[PDB]
Amino acid sequence: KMILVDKVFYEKILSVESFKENIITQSAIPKISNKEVRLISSGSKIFYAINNTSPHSHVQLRLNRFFLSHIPLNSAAKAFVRGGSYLKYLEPHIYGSSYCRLDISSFFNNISFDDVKQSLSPYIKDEYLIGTEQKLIDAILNSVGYESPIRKDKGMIIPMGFRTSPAISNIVFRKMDLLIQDFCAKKGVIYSRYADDMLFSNPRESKLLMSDYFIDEISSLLSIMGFNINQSKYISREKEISINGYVIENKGGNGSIGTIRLSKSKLNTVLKVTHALAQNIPYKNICNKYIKVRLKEKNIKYESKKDEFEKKYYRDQLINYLGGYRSYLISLVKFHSEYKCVNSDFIIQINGILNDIQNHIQKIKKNRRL
Amino acid sequence: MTIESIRVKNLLSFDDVILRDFRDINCIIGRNNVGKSNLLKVIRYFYAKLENKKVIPLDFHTNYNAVGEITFTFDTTRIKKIVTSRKNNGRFHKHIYNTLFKSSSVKLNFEELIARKNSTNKSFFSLTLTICKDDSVMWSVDDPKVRSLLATLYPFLYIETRHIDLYDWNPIWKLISNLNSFNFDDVDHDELVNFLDEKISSRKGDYKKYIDRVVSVIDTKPYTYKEKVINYIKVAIKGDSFVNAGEELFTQSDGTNSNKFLETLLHLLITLTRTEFISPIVYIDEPEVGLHPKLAESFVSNLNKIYSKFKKTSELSGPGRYKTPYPNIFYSTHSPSILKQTIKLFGKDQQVLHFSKKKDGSTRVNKINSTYSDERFLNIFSDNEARLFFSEYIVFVEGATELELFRNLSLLNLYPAFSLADIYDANEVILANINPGYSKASIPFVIIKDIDTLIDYSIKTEKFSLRPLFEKMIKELTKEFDYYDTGFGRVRKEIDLFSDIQSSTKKHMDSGLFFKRFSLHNLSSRINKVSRKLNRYFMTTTIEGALINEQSLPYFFNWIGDVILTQMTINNPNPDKFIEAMRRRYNIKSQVVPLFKSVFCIGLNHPVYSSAVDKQALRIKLSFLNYLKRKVYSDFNNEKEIVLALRLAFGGKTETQYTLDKLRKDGEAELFREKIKNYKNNELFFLEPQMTKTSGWVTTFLNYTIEKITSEESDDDRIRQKLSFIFPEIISIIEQASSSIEA
RNA sequence: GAAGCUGAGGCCAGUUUGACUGGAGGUGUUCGCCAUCUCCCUCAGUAAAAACUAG
DNA sequence: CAAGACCAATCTTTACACTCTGTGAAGTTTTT
DNA sequence: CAAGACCAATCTTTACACTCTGTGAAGTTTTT
DNA sequence: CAAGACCAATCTTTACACTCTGTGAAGTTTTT
RNA sequence: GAAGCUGAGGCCAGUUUGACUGGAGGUGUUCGCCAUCUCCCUCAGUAAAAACUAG
Ligand SMILES: Nc1ncnc2c1ncn2[C@@H]1O[C@H](COP(=O)(O)OP(=O)(O)OP(=O)(O)O)[C@@H](O)[C@H]1O
């Protein structure tokens, strides 16, 4: 039974109180104004952040909780989904012998809003929420989408960091996930996707993934709804590939099993932090030099205790970083225990690093009481 | 081993399911409609497509996926050892080498090959079948010889015991043909014919002529290998048709026939798989259907006897014991007897798999802990404990009174959902070695205890003291040892005050029967809120205290009135003259207590008396009711004292967690104890046999209360709300269990 | 036209009479900074979703 | 630069009339 | 006087030779 | 210029040995 | 580099003071000589396979 939303569904469990005034006075639900959205710059990328006090944030959150979480997705989408994780994206490819990796350029900016409307239409009943002026689907997309002030030409845009944007991206790209999965299956290729990074693997002894034909076919498919392939990040290798530090290897031939292991570049930062901890480097220097976390003087809440405040903050930040990396490798260990696909010697190295991390966190906590 | 893993993606009821770490016996348990046989169908289709049979592809779980994948990881370490060695130069060995392990050792170099040879050999063969949306099937290995050889080496034997043809056991022979491997080049059809003709002829040559005639007339196809071995078996043995204990099959039963069929087949499997390198995977559905519990237990016992008779270890060795790996035996059962005997007789060689279909519809496979380190628990393991594996929600309790309460038929009538939860009283050691927290996700549970197990207040010292269970619980709850910040600051604060409670002191009143300002209700609520993460619920007082609260005083009193009116009779075969004599000797007003002692006594049987006798008895009973009402409301200052006295008489605890026996031993509250003893020995003597915990007063109380309140109120929602108001403690636990069951 | 790229500066080293480029080595390699072994500072600004808290 | 291949769900598919028959004139990591 | 109907179990029923084909030249009650 | 996808048929695939168990020390038209 | 193209000449017309290009029109059209209606000569050289001899 698919999820259906009617007028009562929006008015009772979705809106609750965010748009009570609009529904009692029959006033049109307004666009997300620029006053509610702040524009952050990170790299060349631009992020859009909504203010929490606005009712749009709350209705986005309850939309995410109750509506977008029930629409079926494609199993090739491993990101932003309940139970999906990067290791799951990198696992089906342990069976492959040749690997290829593609990227979609500006995935979130290139999502057409009309495609979002078409994708969400079957799951929302066609009614008139506000008299005969605004339809229910129109109000919901008014809640979900946004108009970019920097680029007014392209009109309504699903922005980065709008709470509901990832789930909507998965839903609107389910069509292409199905198309590309069908094509790869007919070619005998294992396909998976994380956000916009696509990974293909051939378990047979063939050069299909290294050919220009495969790129051309994937691009031809992606042009159906207007996406493009980032040519700078295209990668194709044999018997071993490294994706953001996680190395998948398969030296075997017929019926062989590969292994996934993080490399030393990935563990460089944690190894350096443990080395600095063993060298009795002060905590402030460790936090600033490696963890790029610093206590700006404008962030200090009170002037009553400041010398103690800085030390406690840096102690807590080091504890939090060590615990975070401890849980990141525990995730690796759990994934290996569930699937048995991580390198055994790398499992030994993980165990050693985890014991070192635990001992260092114990030492820091013991020093906290001194 | 035989099979390393089996993975199903988007086929039938499975979304993404991986089964691994197989043991010699794999018991599959789970509710109806969870996919237990869907595993059978998936494996059967995979093996049918392995031999290039023409079958319909299986249906996709959801149509939003363009693929459906089945992955099998065969374990070819032993076959690699078999074939790689230089001694085995046979033609079957040469074929296995040239098909499987060639082109795989080809890619490796000398260093890696030598490393594989010298070190602990571990070789796997992964085969993936992908069904596209247009019913096409694509393999990950494009050599059909490889797939046929894999089917031959690791045959799949499959039985649904429900649809067994009882009166014809022919399908046994076929399966036997799948098991054993040997040579047939030397045996032609000429030497055998000459041998038979020489043995069967009054004149030499006749039988050969007969066989030549039959061969010339007919037109046939050369034998396959399995037909060859079947024919040689059937000629060699004394008889073909099967007989159960000297009696023909059609005269015997159905359960006996199925039991004997399964027993002989499994015995043949284990006996014949000893000498060969062919490692079958056998799947039995319902090994228990139509079997008496004793027969199912005996079936598993005989299976284990055969399994252990051929098993070789460091201590057991000699003639007749083999190191050859046993076939992977899966069987899906719904019988606690099969599972109980499997666990008790196999130990570490068995695995229990739980199949549950979640909320969306996908199947989940989990491993339930079935290995115990305690020999005493293994020996004492019985049907009651093994029943827990089939539970949906286990409510562990401490004493038999909770069992009496939570199993009440009338109480379960108004809460049907809680009828699906099995209540099992668990000692601390039993609860420790069961390990219910290991499953949790598979079988949700809750452990119900009294707050006395945590804190032991001392009246003399006016101090709380922490039991070691509290320290152990705090130790698991101080998660922050190696963690990062989260919204757990409230938890850290609560643990800080839980440690602080030791140093604090609280005064008591009425010689240690109440708290001046401390609210044990607040402490219980905080403890339960904190410890919900550990699935433990602590009640403020004992279960008797939970039943008998200040709010439950009226109905309980009504019960006393009813227990005053109906269930006693006259202690004499002559009610008229006896009642007259006791009315004469004992006054109505001044000596009502001895008069009621002499006249009325508790009796299940109620003889019918004369109308005047009924009138006299009714007047006496009403007078005694009024006298007890006045005496109870006079001797006790407030309702709370009466409730505490009732709790203590039945065996409960005070606010300070003290029983009547504990108070008597410590000597405190002499006045209250004397009042209770006076009420028990003088006015409430008839209730004295019902004062004990095991006397069953809980059942009668709950039955009467439910019947009375249903008489007062008709609607079921109204009756449930009245139950919640009148017993705020028990109804809360039932509601929580039902809510957890629904999800 | 289409494609792609990175926060703002300050000493020190290398290329420049006056400003621009990097701040472990070894080994192998598909040459990708890709893999494996051993051993610079400051100041801004830092949205969202999911996985993960060994046993 | 530009293009074939653009999810899977979603709603009475069984006769009419003049014509008895014819239909029409405060964590890590990843995407980023 | 004399008479039809006189349990159900209990044991290799599959070919031979000369003839390649033919078979042969110290309780009650019941029976009592 | 250069490249994934390079027919379908065609041959005993069932055990070995020391080890009773372990695997090893003179027409038209089309292509043209 | 890869791709593609057609037998050798002689008057006459069109482009050229002196040699090169075509030898029914109408209509429509994907503009392909593609479709539909109506009504230049000479001389060489010309392998193979299949279909087809209305009814
Ligand atoms: N073709 C199919 N497509 C989708 N789901 C299917 C299909 N066939 C069966 N199912 C699902 O799989 C389950 C079928 O029950 P199944 O026999 O697999 O379970 P089971 O535990 O063996 O049952 P039982 O306990 O009665 O033996 C149901 O949940 C059903 O919805």
GROMACS .gro file of N, CA and C and ligand atoms in nm, chain B residues 11-14 28 30-39 41 58-62 283 285-286 332 334 355 357 361 363, ligand 1:
model
  121
  381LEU      N    1   1.448  -1.076  -0.421
  381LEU     CA    2   1.380  -1.191  -0.483
  381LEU      C    3   1.284  -1.246  -0.379
  382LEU      N    4   1.160  -1.271  -0.418
  382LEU     CA    5   1.059  -1.329  -0.327
  382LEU      C    6   1.041  -1.233  -0.210
  383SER      N    7   1.059  -1.277  -0.087
  383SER     CA    8   1.031  -1.191   0.029
  383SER      C    9   1.159  -1.131   0.083
  384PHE      N   10   1.271  -1.143   0.012
  384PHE     CA   11   1.399  -1.096   0.068
  384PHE      C   12   1.442  -0.966   0.001
  398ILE      N   13   1.602  -2.370   1.170
  398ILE     CA   14   1.538  -2.247   1.124
  398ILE      C   15   1.402  -2.237   1.192
  400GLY      N   16   1.077  -1.949   1.323
  400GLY     CA   17   1.019  -1.818   1.292
  400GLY      C   18   0.871  -1.826   1.280
  401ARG      N   19   0.804  -1.712   1.273
  401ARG     CA   20   0.657  -1.711   1.275
  401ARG      C   21   0.607  -1.760   1.141
  402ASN      N   22   0.479  -1.784   1.131
  402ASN     CA   23   0.421  -1.823   1.000
  402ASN      C   24   0.433  -1.701   0.908
  403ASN      N   25   0.447  -1.722   0.777
  403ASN     CA   26   0.464  -1.612   0.678
  403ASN      C   27   0.586  -1.525   0.702
  404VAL      N   28   0.704  -1.580   0.728
  404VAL     CA   29   0.826  -1.497   0.739
  404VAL      C   30   0.931  -1.535   0.636
  405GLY      N   31   0.906  -1.630   0.546
  405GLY     CA   32   1.007  -1.658   0.441
  405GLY      C   33   1.094  -1.779   0.465
  406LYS      N   34   1.063  -1.863   0.562
  406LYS     CA   35   1.151  -1.977   0.595
  406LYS      C   36   1.161  -2.069   0.473
  407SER      N   37   1.050  -2.093   0.404
  407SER     CA   38   1.049  -2.181   0.284
  407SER      C   39   1.092  -2.102   0.162
  408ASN      N   40   1.088  -1.968   0.169
  408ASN     CA   41   1.133  -1.885   0.055
  408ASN      C   42   1.283  -1.909   0.035
  409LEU      N   43   1.356  -1.934   0.144
  409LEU     CA   44   1.500  -1.970   0.130
  409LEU      C   45   1.506  -2.099   0.047
  411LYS      N   46   1.290  -2.212  -0.173
  411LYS     CA   47   1.256  -2.186  -0.313
  411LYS      C   48   1.372  -2.118  -0.385
  428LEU      N   49   1.192  -1.640  -1.061
  428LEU     CA   50   1.120  -1.610  -0.936
  428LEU      C   51   1.078  -1.464  -0.939
  429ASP      N   52   0.980  -1.426  -0.858
  429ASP     CA   53   0.924  -1.290  -0.865
  429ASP      C   54   1.008  -1.193  -0.784
  430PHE      N   55   1.007  -1.067  -0.823
  430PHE     CA   56   1.094  -0.970  -0.754
  430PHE      C   57   1.021  -0.921  -0.631
  431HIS      N   58   1.093  -0.894  -0.523
  431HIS     CA   59   1.034  -0.841  -0.400
  431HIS      C   60   0.966  -0.708  -0.427
  432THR      N   61   1.036  -0.616  -0.492
  432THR     CA   62   0.979  -0.490  -0.536
  432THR      C   63   1.019  -0.466  -0.680
  653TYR      N   64   1.800  -2.991   0.294
  653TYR     CA   65   1.701  -2.898   0.348
  653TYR      C   66   1.571  -2.973   0.372
  655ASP      N   67   1.187  -2.956   0.537
  655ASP     CA   68   1.082  -2.866   0.586
  655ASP      C   69   1.005  -2.946   0.689
  656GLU      N   70   0.966  -2.885   0.799
  656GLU     CA   71   0.879  -2.952   0.897
  656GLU      C   72   0.926  -3.094   0.930
  702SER      N   73   1.357  -2.659   0.886
  702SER     CA   74   1.267  -2.560   0.942
  702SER      C   75   1.158  -2.630   1.021
  704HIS      N   76   0.857  -2.605   1.364
  704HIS     CA   77   0.768  -2.518   1.445
  704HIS      C   78   0.743  -2.594   1.575
  725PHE      N   79   1.375  -1.616   1.158
  725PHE     CA   80   1.322  -1.545   1.043
  725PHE      C   81   1.204  -1.460   1.088
  727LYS      N   82   0.940  -1.136   0.951
  727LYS     CA   83   0.914  -1.039   0.842
  727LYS      C   84   0.882  -0.908   0.910
  731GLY      N   85   0.771  -0.565   0.492
  731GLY     CA   86   0.752  -0.694   0.429
  731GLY      C   87   0.880  -0.771   0.404
  733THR      N   88   1.219  -0.992   0.480
  733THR     CA   89   1.256  -1.094   0.576
  733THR      C   90   1.388  -1.057   0.643
 1320LIG     N1   91   0.608  -1.438  -0.539
 1320LIG     C1   92   0.617  -1.369  -0.425
 1320LIG     N2   93   0.640  -1.236  -0.431
 1320LIG     C2   94   0.649  -1.168  -0.316
 1320LIG     N3   95   0.637  -1.212  -0.191
 1320LIG     C3   96   0.614  -1.344  -0.190
 1320LIG     C4   97   0.602  -1.427  -0.298
 1320LIG     N4   98   0.578  -1.557  -0.256
 1320LIG     C5   99   0.575  -1.549  -0.125
 1320LIG     N5  100   0.596  -1.423  -0.079
 1320LIG     C6  101   0.599  -1.377   0.058
 1320LIG     O1  102   0.678  -1.466   0.132
 1320LIG     C7  103   0.602  -1.522   0.241
 1320LIG     C8  104   0.560  -1.662   0.204
 1320LIG     O2  105   0.568  -1.745   0.321
 1320LIG     P1  106   0.688  -1.848   0.329
 1320LIG     O3  107   0.640  -1.984   0.292
 1320LIG     O4  108   0.804  -1.792   0.255
 1320LIG     O5  109   0.717  -1.844   0.486
 1320LIG     P2  110   0.729  -1.963   0.590
 1320LIG     O6  111   0.786  -1.911   0.716
 1320LIG     O7  112   0.794  -2.077   0.522
 1320LIG     O8  113   0.578  -2.005   0.617
 1320LIG     P3  114   0.531  -2.127   0.707
 1320LIG     O9  115   0.571  -2.087   0.844
 1320LIG    O10  116   0.383  -2.140   0.694
 1320LIG    O11  117   0.604  -2.248   0.657
 1320LIG     C9  118   0.489  -1.423   0.263
 1320LIG    O12  119   0.537  -1.312   0.337
 1320LIG    C10  120   0.460  -1.375   0.121
 1320LIG    O13  121   0.407  -1.245   0.122
   0.00000   0.00000   0.00000
